[PDB]
Design a protein around this ligand. Sequence first.
Ligand SMILES: *[C@@H]1O[C@H](CO)[C@@H](O)[C@H](O)[C@H]1NC(C)=O
Ligand SMILES: *[C@@H]1O[C@H](CO)[C@@H](O)[C@H](O)[C@H]1NC(C)=O
Lengths: 244, 244, 68, 68
Amino acid sequence: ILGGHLDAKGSFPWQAKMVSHHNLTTGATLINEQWLLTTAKNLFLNHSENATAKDIAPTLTLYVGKKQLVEIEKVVLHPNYSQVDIGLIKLKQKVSVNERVMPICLPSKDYAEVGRVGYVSGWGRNANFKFTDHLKYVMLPVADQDQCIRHYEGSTVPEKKTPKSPVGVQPILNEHTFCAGMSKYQEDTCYGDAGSAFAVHDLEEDTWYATGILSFDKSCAVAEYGVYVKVTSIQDWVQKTIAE
Amino acid sequence: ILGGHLDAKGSFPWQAKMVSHHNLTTGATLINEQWLLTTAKNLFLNHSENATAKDIAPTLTLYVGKKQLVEIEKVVLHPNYSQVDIGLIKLKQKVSVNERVMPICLPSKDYAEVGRVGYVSGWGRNANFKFTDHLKYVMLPVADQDQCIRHYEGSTVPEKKTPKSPVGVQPILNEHTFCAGMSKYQEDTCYGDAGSAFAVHDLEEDTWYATGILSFDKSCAVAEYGVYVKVTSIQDWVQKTIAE
Amino acid sequence: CPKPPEIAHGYVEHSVRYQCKNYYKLRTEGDGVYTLNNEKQWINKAVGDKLPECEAVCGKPKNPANPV
Amino acid sequence: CPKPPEIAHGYVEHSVRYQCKNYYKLRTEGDGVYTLNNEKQWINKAVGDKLPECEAVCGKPKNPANPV
Ligand SMILES: *[C@@H]1O[C@H](CO)[C@@H](O)[C@H](O)[C@H]1NC(C)=O
Ligand SMILES: *[C@@H]1O[C@H](CO)[C@@H](O)[C@H](O)[C@H]1NC(C)=O
């Protein structure tokens, strides 16, 4: 996370830190006492595209709360993870829920309206290209979907698209996706922030909801928007996978 | 009790059997888990008129239920037992209350209306002048007070009274007293029935009340009425003596 | 007791209700319900820790005499 | 337990009420109250002998982030 605020009060107990077997740090989101949401790209880090779910699980390390290790039982990739960059992690044991470890709610409403402000916490790289030592968060607004597709691709028309990504690497954009623009300065998400939740605070209920999971975390304030997976677009697959 | 019915169902759990140290049997009435009502004449049986309460208590034997001995702590004679033939017995221990041992209620209403039918149980002598082997009861109606005073004395006028008792011995008659005539035959109370309750069954509440304590038990079907102590006329002294 | 089963991340508060056997009645200004608090005390709301009493019933014979 | 005091000619029926600690919520179709019957069984009226569960509360951070 470039710029932003330090999680000094511990306001994101659903944030988890995942580490690959070659010491790359990514994010995950506790949605359950036993389950976490993350991206498929995170799970395939330091692997080949030929790896399976049973191959990936033993090579992962996962922390919640204050550097609290949690054992992983298995992972479940989304059946279409090439368009829906999502994976589910199941823990062997129910994690004990307290003020440092607590799942975020899955939303029943669609909060992904252009302009709605969400909170993104992350262990990703900072302004010095270094993995942050303490958890940071940033407030980002949902961006216009067509302007986002226009910035990272050619146009809305499929037969007119071109790369054009200011970071080179192309994000996944489709119906399951929304974008989040620059807050007000040059603060943004960056490498390692993927898997974290675009958290929305429902002031009517005073409840925090995972509206999105950060998928494209390579617009390190040199491209416009990060790209997030709509949680409402995967909620059905999530509830089915959890049981079981 | 001359004639009457055998207590074959055990319908008088408040009935107690008191025995003097010379084997005379009289009655007492459980009004409490620790207290019983009886007559002063019963307690002075086989004693001199000079005896006190502490003299009488150790010489008594008392049974409740099915020949169940109960230890006596003390007796309390009525301060005016020459007109109110009443004494109170206190047990050392609370008696266990069941279907064979149960106190009768003290009435809040005056049931001593001329003609009201009450039940009198008793261990007294039967038609053969013998103490009965099993508890007996008889249904008797309240008699006219003036006709009763006229039969056992001269008249209502104090300066006109004469003995005239068909049994010779005179009953105590005053304001604290009511009489009970012959039921319908020649069945009545007799020697040893004193201390028993003139029990009234309040059909409105379905509750049995001690309306009177039998004092004069010598009208063995040759005089008209037995004479009973109004329980309502001693209720205040009873509640004060019980505490304590 | 006998020990109510324990549930994970849950706890039990113990209540007790006093009743009298035959042939007795409950004598108390409260409702007879007592709850165990942190001080090892069974408290009724609100006769305090004052326990109920069982008083004998008068004049209710099990087999009453035949009616008049 | 710890043993409610016994009264003469009285008896106790034991009730128990389940509640969840932080940061959990009670998951049950009954009211969480279970009464001990003659068969050494704690019975709720009426989820039966089915015990409650304590489920974790989601999205209620103890120290939420500063508002927008
Ligand atoms: C995966 O992709 C196919 C595309 O043919 C779609 O029909 C299916 O529903 C998708 N599955 C989920 C769980 O979204
Ligand atoms: C006993 O007799 C006297 C008569 O002078 C009367 O005043 C008093 O109240 C009587 N006591 C009781 C308990 O009835």
